[PDB]
A paper describes a structure:
In the DNA complex structures of Etv5 and Fev (which are determined to 1.9 and 2.0 Å resolution, respectively), we observe a network of coordinated water molecules contributing to sequence recognition upstream to the GGA core. From analysis of the high resolution structures of the Etv5 and Fev DNA complexes (which are high enough resolution (< 2.0 Å) to reliably locate ordered waters), a number of additional contacts can be seen, which appear to enable direct readout of additional base pairs both upstream and downstream of the GGA core. The two C-G base pairs at positions −2 and −1 lie close to a highly coordinated network of four water molecules conserved in both structures and are coordinated by polar contacts to the side chains of Asp-387 (Fev Asp-99), Ser-390 (Fev Ser-102), Arg-394 (Fev Arg-106), Tyr-412 (Fev Tyr-124), and the phosphate oxygens of the two cytosine nucleotides at positions −2 and −1. The requirement in this network for the water closest to the base at position −1 to be a hydrogen bond acceptor almost perfectly explains the observed sequence preferences at this position, with a strong selection of cytosine (∼75% occurrence) and the only other allowed base being adenine (∼15% occurrence), which is also able to donate a hydrogen bond, although in this case the hydrogen bonding distance would be significantly longer (≈4.0 Å). In the Etv5 and Fev DNA complex structures, the corresponding residue (Etv5-Tyr-428 and Fev-Tyr-107, respectively) can be seen to occupy two conformations, one in which the two interactions detailed above are conserved, and an additional conformation where the side chain hydroxyl lies close to Etv5-Lys-432/Fev-Lys-111 and provides a large contact surface, with the potential for favorable van der Waals interactions to bases at positions +5 and +6 on the complementary strand. The finding that both conformations of this residue appear to occur together indicates that the dynamic nature of the side chains of the recognition helix may be even more important for DNA recognition than previously thought.
Numbering used by the authors: 44 to 135
Write the structure that this text describes.
DNA sequence: CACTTCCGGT
DNA sequence: ACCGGAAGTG
């Protein structure tokens, strides 16, 4: 469609320490955490033109990435996901 | 296409 | 919180 993709949006946030308040790399091996899921969802909505966006819908988008091998869940760790760069590369 | 909505189930 | 099927939006 041309619109910005979620993975790009998240990498941009994660590439700036200024955003550690809501999202940051943590744990290691591509692991990151949404330290403020509501905030991240708000930014995503605003950035995407979907004002009724929330973590419920955002996380669903993240889960959609599971099948694409672009991301996976850190099982048992609240709000903690894992970026798969090899998978991202294989998608290109 | 790449999500966004919705929501019953774990 | 997290999962994931199914139908809908730009």
């Amino acid at each position: 469609s041309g619109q910005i993709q979620l993975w790009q949006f998240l990498l941009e946030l994660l590439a700036d320490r200024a955003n550690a308040g809501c999202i940051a790399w943590e744990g290691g091996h591509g692991e990151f955490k949404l330290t403020d899921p509501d905030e991240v969802a708000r930014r995503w909505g605003e950035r995407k033109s979907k004002p009724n966006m929330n973590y419920d819908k955002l996380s669903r988008a993240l889960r959609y990435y599971y099948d694409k091998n672009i991301m996976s869940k850190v099982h048992g760790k609240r709000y903690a996901y894992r970026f798969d760069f090899q998978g991202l590369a294989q998608a290109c």
